[PDB]
């Protein structure tokens, strides 16, 4: 189940200055970058155009190109419409896309965050405020819902254009998505917290456990999944032990890249 994300982030410092940058993810892999400086959207994968024709992508890029400008003036006008109830600096994020499921099944989303808090979502045919959101947002919402063009466009994009495009992406990016990368493991200790460093594995699912021969340790504490530059994963596991207990122990790593060939690393 791959989740497709178009991540927009807009900074409004004062009444005049502002910028908007976008990044696009299919799963844990980046497909597009759209910097504020770049008038056009940039592909970050050879397969980022999915199964779309050149005309189709162009009609779709031009649509977004207009949106970015439209969005910039619109916020500034909504700030004026609200003032003094809202004030600069203003920080707005958008998480929009569609998650894919077996068959031709998918669910689309458009989530808007105001000042680091999730406040607004597009649902069905209209914009609405989420629970917890302030009541003054009802007016901007009403105004956006007045615009029937945007509503029709967003419905098409969320209902049709998102899942159609991602179904095309999965075919074009199979080799990169279904790619397998072997993890590399090394050990260290710190004043002793025994660490099992694991790096360079793809996909993201992994199994790293400390074992005293067969004894799966109850004190194994897995850390956070941290990224690498070459689009692979890094993770570490810290064990809580006393001095002298260094020998006799090992770190075992299970991954799809090895296929039964479990890495076992003795200290």
């Amino acid at each position, epitope marked *: 189940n791959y989740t497709f994300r178009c991540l927009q982030m807009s900074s409004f410092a004062n009444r005049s200055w502002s910028r908007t940058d976008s990044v696009v993810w299919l799963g844990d892999l980046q497909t597009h970058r759209w910097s504020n400086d770049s008038a056009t959207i940039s592909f970050t994968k050879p397969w980022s155009q999915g199964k779309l024709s050149n005309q189709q992508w162009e009609k779709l890029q031009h649509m977004f190109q207009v949106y970015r400008v439209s969005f910039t003036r619109d916020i500034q006008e909504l700030v*004026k*419409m609200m003032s003094p109830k809202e004030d600069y600096p203003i920080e707005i994020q958008l998480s929009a896309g569609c998650e894919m499921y077996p068959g031709n099944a998918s669910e689309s989303f458009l989530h808007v965050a105001f000042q680091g808090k999730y406040v607004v979502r597009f649902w069905g045919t209209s914009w609405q405020t989420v629970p917890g959101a302030p009541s003054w947002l009802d007016l901007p919402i009403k105004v956006l819902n*007045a615009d029937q063009g945007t509503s029709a466009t967003v419905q098409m994009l969320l209902n049709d254009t998102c899942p159609l495009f991602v179904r095309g992406l999965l075919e074009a990016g199979k080799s990169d998505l279904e790619k397998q990368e072997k993890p590399v493991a090394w050990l260290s200790s710190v004043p002793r917290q025994l660490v099992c460093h694991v790096s360079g594995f793809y996909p993201k699912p992994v199994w790293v456990m400390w074992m005293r021969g067969d004894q799966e340790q109850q004190g194994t504490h897995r850390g956070d999944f941290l990224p690498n530059a070459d689009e692979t994963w890094y993770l570490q596991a810290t064990l809580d032990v006393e001095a002298g207990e260094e020998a006799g122990l090992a770190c075992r790593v299970k991954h799809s890249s090895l296929g039964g060939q479990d890495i076992i690393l003795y200290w």
Partner: T-cell receptor
Amino acid sequence: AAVTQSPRNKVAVTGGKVTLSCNQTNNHNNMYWYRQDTGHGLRLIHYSYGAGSTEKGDIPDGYKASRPSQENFSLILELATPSQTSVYFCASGDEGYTQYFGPGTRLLVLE
Amino acid sequence: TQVEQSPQSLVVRQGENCVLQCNYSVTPDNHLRWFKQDTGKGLVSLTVLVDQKDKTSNGRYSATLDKDAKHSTLHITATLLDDTATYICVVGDRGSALGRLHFGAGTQLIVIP
């Protein structure tokens, strides 16, 4: 929807204070001040998103705007000039795109 | 000036048809509206076009919108003496109150009785 303007027609002197009024009982949040000049289309001067609000338009110089209430939106010319001789149009509207225009105000500033 | 009207002025005889042009570069083009302004009077709306390819008709008035060409025409069928007025093209950049309207200078029409 109805929008009224007062006065309908006005003659003023350079340096004098002139207040053009606009009344709307449509309960519209938004109200707009334009001027019409031969050779140009209507150009925006000032606009308000509700009581208290006022925002500069495309050509705001020489004009001050006041929105005392939902009902009324005034254009104030502090020190009148012959360059401000024009037909001034007022418009109002809700959250939709439709702007409902008043009858229009002819202003003539003489020396 | 993102809105341009043609002709600047024209003179027709009672009964004949006349077509009025409007070309614009306004981005985006949500809707286009036609106004009739009798000399000294205010702005009477004639019609409003909204679709990518659009056609409307209000009595003897009929207008067409082609957004791809960013171009619009207003045909007046069987002109009457009453039609002597300036006809104004107006493009709005949003489908809500966030929009700003962009006004053409107007095509002048004089109908000979």
